[PDB]
Amino acid sequence: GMKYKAAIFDMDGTILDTSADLTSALNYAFEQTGHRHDFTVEDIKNFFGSGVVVAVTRALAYEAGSSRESLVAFGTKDEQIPEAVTQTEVNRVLEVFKPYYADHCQIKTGPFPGILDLMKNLRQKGVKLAVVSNKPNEAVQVLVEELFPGSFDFALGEKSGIRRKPAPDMTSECVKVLGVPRDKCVYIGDSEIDIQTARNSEMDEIAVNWGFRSVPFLQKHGATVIVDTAEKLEEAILGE
Ligand SMILES: [Cl-]
Ligand code: NA
DSSP states (O other): OSSSSSSOOOSSSTEEHHHHHHHHHHHHHHHHHTTTOOOOOOHHHHOOOSSSSHHHHHHHHHHHHHHHHHTTTSTTOOOOOTTOOOOHHHHHHHHHHHHHHHTTTTSSSSOTTHHHHHHHHHHHHOOOOEEEEEHHHHHHHHHHHHEEEEEEOOEEEEHHHHHHSTHHHHHHHHHHHHTTOOOEEEEEESOOOOOOOOHTTTTTEEEEESSSOHHHHHHHTTTOOEEEEEHHHHHHTTTT
């Protein structure tokens, strides 16, 4: 048999090392709109995961003095968004950030060590491969085409009018195309949103430690299999 006939990957922090380009683009957008613009890569790892609206909302709150802890619940029913932060301002920053990022998403960005080999090896073992990401779709499509041509059976990022992860909708779009039962799918990602997306899609999940959340964070948030190399991730997907 096969443990999993389909492996569905998040992009940021999982298959692509994106934090530098995200940082540069966020700081550009902030500067262009009159805000502080000295965010670090570590800041960006706390902002992204839940889509660009939540990411900019988090970044604006952080500029306003919010703790890193407080940012986690942004995008959830328990969010405590400071009165300093408005969606109107979020949208004004995004107007610069989205196109800038799209045009600058492949400067420092590449695959993590081992990932190209992983994809080759999994396809050789007959596993279907997909990307489902909260990165805007336009940037997802460019990156897959340039860095992973012919690798994926399906690739989708966030689009207006379709719910972001951890709603099941985007992964259900993937499941439909791949034609694999959910019990033969595994979702692979670096955050709590990936943990939730898997559960909401009635499939198993593997967490990676080379992305935007720490191991103690992932454990706190319900990760059960956590791997720290691409080889170990291959073994997890194959059940070896
Ligand atoms: Cl995101
Ligand atoms: Na991610």
